[PDB]
């Protein structure tokens, strides 16, 4: 179960975040710990495509090799706070699992600048829900979390020390597929 009403960044700059580029997850915190594996790789692209607000997601479990992509259109609840109805696709945008009622995530940008961000997401997916999940993002897949984003983690009354890093997983991404999935 999700439990947090995450607060969006004051003065969030939507066009800069949703610029069509890629964000890498460098660290994550699942509130229900056995909710997700202890080793993971995830990234997204976020942009407007033909007037529509979009995200493309990539998940990879580096131990099992489980891999999946998703595309969503985001609807706006308030500045920096969205509800997204996802379709599972291959890397080329071919639909594997269509959009359906009940399959959605919420997405809140708690902090962002040109290079880093802190987000919250709540996944709803039939009998495969996840609880609250926070992620530190960077434009550079190898960047250690800096002071701006770590201060934002503190300001959210979270302990960065509890976040799990993705950096020791040999994560390798297909940026081209994430960018082109925005259109799909
Ligand atoms: C970056 C922000 C993230 C968003 C918006 C997000 C969103 C999603 C969505 C929409 C799905 C379902 C996809 C489908 O069935 O087609 C999913 C599944 C999953 N995600 Fe994430 N995710 C993110 C990051 C992460 C991270 C960092 C982890 C763990 C390190 C993670 C772990 C999982 C797992 C294990 C599943 C499959 C299990 C399930 O569907 O219940 N995700 N995620």
From Swiss-Prot:
Gene3D superfamilies with a match to the protein in the record: 2.40.128.20
What tissue specificity is annotated for this entry? Salivary gland (at protein level).
One GO CC term, this protein: extracellular region
Top-level taxon of origin: Eukaryota
Q: Give a yes or no for keyword Zinc in this entry.
A: no
- Result when mutating residue 55 to Q: Stabilization of the ferric-NO heme center
Please tell me where heme binds in this chain.
Answer: 59
Q: What else is known?
A: Superposition of the structures of NP4 in the presence of ammonia or nitrite shows a conformational change of the protein upon NO(2)(-) binding.
What's the protein called, per UniProt?
A: Nitrophorin-4
| Naturally occurring in which organism (per UniProt) | Rhodnius prolixus
